[PDB]
Amino acid sequence: KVKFTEEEDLKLQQLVMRYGAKDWIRISQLMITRNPRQCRERWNNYINPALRTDPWSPEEDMLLDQKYAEYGPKWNKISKFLKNRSDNNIRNRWMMIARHRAKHQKS
């Protein structure tokens, strides 16, 4: 997980809404515990395009088995390969698709 907790990711929606999405150096001054790119990575992988409903397809499932196998549930690194979804969508959809392979229905 990232240094800050999801609860912070919500603060980003507010602070970033006040800065728009370009003064990360300022938002980082408040919480120097993270780099400007760390909170920005959430902007596109959490709030910016309104992906409250942008679920991926088996393409990420098969291409994720390769990335996850390396990073694992770090939707922070995966969401960067999508730039179309958010960790909240991946962490949430992976549990929907992982629920099918959870038992053995995989075959």
Domains assigned to the chain: 1-53 (1.10.10.60), 54-107 (1.10.10.60)
Burial class (CB in 10 A: 0-12, 13-18, 19+), 12: buried
Residue-by-residue DSSP string for 28-97: HHHTTTS-HHHHHHHHHHHSSS--TT----HHHHHHHHHHHHHT-S-HHHHHHHHSSS-HHHHHHHHHHH
Q: Tokens 């400007």 belong to which residue?
A: 36
> Do the Cβ atoms of 25 and 36 come closer than 8 Å?
yes
13: closest CA among 30, 1, 27, 32?
27
Please tell me whether residue 106 adopts helix, strand or coil conformation.
Answer: coil
Q: Tokens 């980003």 belong to which residue?
A: 12
Please tell me whether residue 6 adopts helix, strand or coil conformation.
Answer: helix
